[PDB]
Design a protein around this ligand. Structure first.
Ligand code: CA
Ligand code: CA
Ligand code: CA
Ligand code: CA
Ligand code: CA
Ligand code: CA
Ligand code: CA
Ligand code: CA
Ligand code: CA
Ligand code: CA
Lengths: 680, 65, 174
């Protein structure tokens, strides 16, 4: 299991190409200038002249997917500012087990070759498989972008292409934090150190991270460094991602020396200070330790003393495979809660607390901290949790001249009287009169803002925002809570409130009303129903809808038409109206801004409130199809959405009368149930 | 008779619902992050040198002849 | 065969700044285009309908149609519009319940009396007559569910098995 990006299956597309004796041509990321870039590498940039896409089989007669292993020296930067990504790849090669998930190791130019390759990336909580054709950009017969120090090796070139593909183009990979690559290769958890304010025992931390299979990168702050010189006199590159590949303590002429191994993803240009490949102070170390640690090789990789590392670098980025801090001496039990959301101009795009008029319009999320999960590390008693707010698909916006938003979040205690009661939204006046109990360490234009917290047991509301209001974007939140000894949710449920529609339940008052609405044939048709709904909604300002469609009414009829009449009798209209009463109660209660409509956040709340426990992928699918281009759902679409969903759950349970995971259908009834619904 | 039935369906939907100045005045500061690789001089010199050497509706309507 | 290079310049002009056609823009494109064709009778493409079309074509999950998605949608409309005109044998500008089977058949949907009757119930309000917008809407959906089936039937048995998640993810589009 892993999402198939663009619904492209690798084995299906490879097998058809092999059987066709063809080589794969990806229609979704074609060998054209649009796949290169949009500005500096766009159709109108003179830097793109002479660029030709060549398969590895067109630039040599014996290409290898991997040769000599998949190692860091296979990652050499080309004509793109994606060092952040490449340092990530290089670091990944050091953990063979996790490398093998991103890069299916069994791919080959010699067996079952059909010009198609595949890779796997963690994307905002989900693993995603990406297929690419093997056409790579070249200029003057040589690979333009990433290439291996081994000229005939192509795995890393193909990996960078696949990652360019999901971002729209290669130029979009320019500029970033190495943590972004780290995460997209591990789904791991970031731990960051500022080297001017480092923890004590940071050398032990680094050694531990490496021992543990964590990925490590470092970099020099360039704004606050030689204006127009990125390359320093000691051959270090500022504003450029390096990988940390090792850390050893050595005895040197009787003295203890702490050494860190660093790699420039250029695969060339190295530190020329103490402990460089050619340093005379290597003679000062035991020969067999020398032979094991160091080589005289222009490969981007060098040693420096830890002191020099601290005096020269600004930041250490670390991606751990667990939510456990490296400074802790034991492993904890953890629970991941994934949430997703959307800020949209006109509705949920509230901006931060500096903008109190709209701040209250942001999506809100419950964080429940349990008494039982209590720990006392550092000697503070409370519930440990991590919140990571990650903004999504922001590189595709580069074409628009849009980048990462400045993001962050605040955490608030819920009032005692409001406790144990979800669906709540904290008002404007609440924010005007009460401060956040916690916040993110800052608001910043990083893809992810991840913080570690400890608070007393209870219920908290997380408010994720951009800094300025009216910014559009998708996000998701990871909440990792420390747990005591469990082994809350993982299933898809419709816990909906079923209805009394026996004859005993329906009184004279409703019977009179129905008879009056049914007319001559004693039944309510869809046309009659549309007229009824048009008419009652006309009386109410608080329920906005663009009229009520006949196709929505036809579905409502079919949902409840238990006899085969094709129209609504007494009990069937009673169920219907009772459903409509509930739908609009939910709708109006959850209608925070009193807009008469559901924004994407309100719709999520309404789905939970109607009794649906759904994964995020379903929620996004619902807002698409049921929402407009402002991501607003009016009453007409609200009812259609909830009616259809209840229909679909019930069609599924049935066809599956004994609760197994799955259902079996042929093309004829698949097209029939998916398009025409209520049939069984 | 019918107008009454609609008034009654409407009444059955129920009635909805139900100012302050900023007291705490909580303020947030923004930081800008460093973007690694964003500067062109962080690309290898070798690869720098290598790189540096009818209106629409009528056209569509026409597809439907 | 560079109908392709001409259509690429065409897409760029209507797609606007983001280089993608949104549901709103597609509503505008389609309404303007069928305005020219009096024999393609329709009460209009609504945002509701256009959003459904974008949803099912939205392979890369951008919320809008990129070139390749628009091209595929458009080429389908180009084909289906000709089917529509051919099988409007009474030249009424609409497809009646007697005209419907032969028209879904020619589109590659070879159903039966029962299925066609349920389609006519669900997609025709005009005494068993189907507008141009309902027609395109229905076929987009049928096509989407057909592609969904073919993709999920990888061994080629004529049988798919889905869990509750993929079931709801596929059927909630239609
Ligand atoms: Ca290698
Ligand atoms: Ca070296
Ligand atoms: Ca009647
Ligand atoms: Ca009935
Ligand atoms: Ca609202
Ligand atoms: Ca609507
Ligand atoms: Ca557009
Ligand atoms: Ca799209
Ligand atoms: Ca006709
Ligand atoms: Ca219509």
């Amino acid at each position: 299991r892993a999402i198939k990006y663009l619904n492209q299956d690798y084995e299906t597309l490879r097998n058809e190409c092999l059987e066709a004796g063809a080589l794969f041509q990806d229609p979704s990321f074609p060998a054209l200038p649009s796949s290169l870039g949009f500005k500096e590498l766009g159709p109108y940039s003179s830097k793109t002249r002479g660029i030709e896409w060549k398969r590895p089989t067109e630039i040599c007669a014996d290409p290898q997917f991997i040769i000599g292993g998949a190692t860091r020296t296979d990652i050499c930067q080309g004509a793109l500012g994606d060092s952040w990504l490449l340092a990530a790849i290089a670091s990944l090669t050091l953990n063979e087990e996790i490398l093998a998930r991103v890069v299916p190791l069994d791919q080959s130019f010699q067996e079952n070759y059909a010009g198609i390759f595949h890779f796997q990336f963690w994307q905002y909580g989900e693993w995603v498989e990406v297929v690419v054709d093997d056409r790579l950009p070249t200029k003057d017969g040589e690979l333009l972008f990433v290439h291996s120090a081994e000229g005939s090796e192509f795995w890393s070139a193909l990996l960078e292409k696949a990652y360019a593909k999901i971002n729209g183009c290669y130029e979009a990979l320019s500029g970033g934090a190495t943590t972004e690559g780290f995460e997209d290769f591990t789904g791991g958890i970031a731990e960051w150190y500022e080297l001017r304010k480092p923890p004590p025992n940071l050398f032990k931390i680094i050694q531990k991270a490496l021992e543990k299979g964590s990925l490590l990168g470092c970099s020099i702050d360039i704004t606050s460094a030689a204006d127009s010189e990125a390359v320093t006199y000691q051959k270090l590159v500022k504003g450029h991602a390096y990988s940390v590949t090792g850390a050893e303590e050595v005895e040197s002429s009787g003295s203890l020396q702490k050494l860190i191994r660093i790699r420039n993803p250029w695969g060339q240009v190295e530190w020329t200070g103490k402990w460089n490949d050619n340093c005379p102070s290597w003679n000062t170390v035991d020969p067999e330790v020398r032979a094991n640690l160091t080589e005289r090789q222009e490969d981007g990789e060098f040693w420096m003393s830890f002191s020099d590392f601290l005096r020269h670098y600004s930041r250490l980025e670390i991606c751990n495979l667990t939510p456990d801090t490296l400074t802790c001496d034991s492993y904890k039990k953890w629970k991941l809660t994934k949430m997703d959301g959307n800020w949209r101009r006109g509705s949920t795009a509230g901006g931060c607390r500096n903008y109190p008029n709209t701040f209250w319009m942001n999506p809100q999320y419950l964080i429940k901290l349990e008494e039982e999960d209590e720990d006392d590390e550092d000697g503070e008693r409370g519930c440990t949790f991590l919140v990571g707010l990650i903004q999504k698909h922001r590189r595709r916006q580069r074409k628009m001249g849009e980048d990462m938003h400045t993001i962050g979040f605040g955490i608030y205690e819920v009032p005692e009287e409001l406790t144990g009661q979800t669906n709540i939204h904290l008002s404007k006046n609440f924010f005007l009169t009460t401060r956040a109990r916690e916040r993110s360490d800052t608001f910043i234009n990083l893809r992810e803002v991840l913080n570690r917290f400890k608070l007393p047991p209870g219920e908290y509301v997380l408010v994720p925002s951009t800094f300025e209001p009216h910014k559009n974007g998708d996000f998701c939140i990871r909440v990792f809570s420390e747990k005591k000894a469990d082994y809350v949710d993982d299933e898809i449920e419709a816990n909906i409130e079923e209805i009394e529609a026996n004859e005993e339940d329906i009184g004279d008052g409703f019977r009179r009303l129905f008879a009056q609405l049914a007319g001559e044939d004693a039944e309510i048709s869809a046309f009659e129903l549309q007229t009824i709904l048009r008419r009652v909604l006309a009386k109410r300002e608080d329920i906005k809808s663009d009229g009520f469609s006949i196709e929505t009414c036809k579905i409502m009829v079919d949902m409840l038409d238990e006899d085969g009449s094709g129209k609504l009798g007494l009990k069937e209209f009673y169920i219907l109206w009772t459903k409509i009463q509930k739908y609009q109660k939910i709708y109006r209660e959850i209608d925070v801004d009193r807009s008469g409509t559901m924004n994407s956040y309100e719709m999520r709340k309404a789905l939970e409130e109607a009794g649906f426990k759904l994964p995020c992928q379903l929620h996004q699918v619902i807002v698409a199809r049921f929402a407009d281009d402002e991501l607003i759902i009016d009453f007409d679409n609200f009812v259609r959405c909830l009616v259809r969903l209840e229909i679909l759950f019930k069609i599924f349970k049935q066809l599956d009368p004994e609760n197994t995971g799955t259902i079996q259908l042929d093309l004829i009834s698949w097209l029939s149930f998916s398009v025409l619904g209520k049939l069984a | 008779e019918l107008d009454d039935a609609l008034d009654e369906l409407s009444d059955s939907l129920g009635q909805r619902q139900p100012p302050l100045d900023d007291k705490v005045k909580e303020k947030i500061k923004a930081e800008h992050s460093e973007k690694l690789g964003e500067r062109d001089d962080t690309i290898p010199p070798e690869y720098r040198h290598l790189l540096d050497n009818q209106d629409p509706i009528d056209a569509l309507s026409e597809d439907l002849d | 065969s560079e109908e392709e290079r001409q259509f690429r310049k065409l897409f760029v002009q209507l797609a606007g700044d983001d280089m993608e056609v949104s549901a709103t823009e597609l509503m505008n494109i389609l309404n303007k285009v069928v305005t020219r064709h009096p024999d393609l009778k329709t009460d209009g493409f609504g945002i509701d309908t256009c959003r459904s079309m974008v949803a099912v074509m939205d392979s890369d999950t951008t919320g809008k149609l990129g070139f390749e998605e628009f091209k595929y949608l458009w080429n389908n409309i180009k084909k289906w519009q000709g089917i529509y005109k051919r099988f409007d044998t009474d030249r009424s500008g609409t497809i009646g319940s007697n005209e419907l089977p032969g028209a879904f058949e020619a589109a590659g949907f070879h159903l039966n009396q029962h299925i066609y009757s349920m389609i006519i119930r669900r997609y025709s309000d005009e005494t068993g007559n189907m507008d141009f917008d309902n027609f395109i809407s229905c076929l987009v959906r049928l096509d989407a569910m057909f592609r969904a089936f073919r993709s999920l039937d990888k061994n080629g048995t004529g049988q798919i098995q889905v869990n509750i998640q993929e079931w709801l993810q596929l059927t909630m589009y239609s």
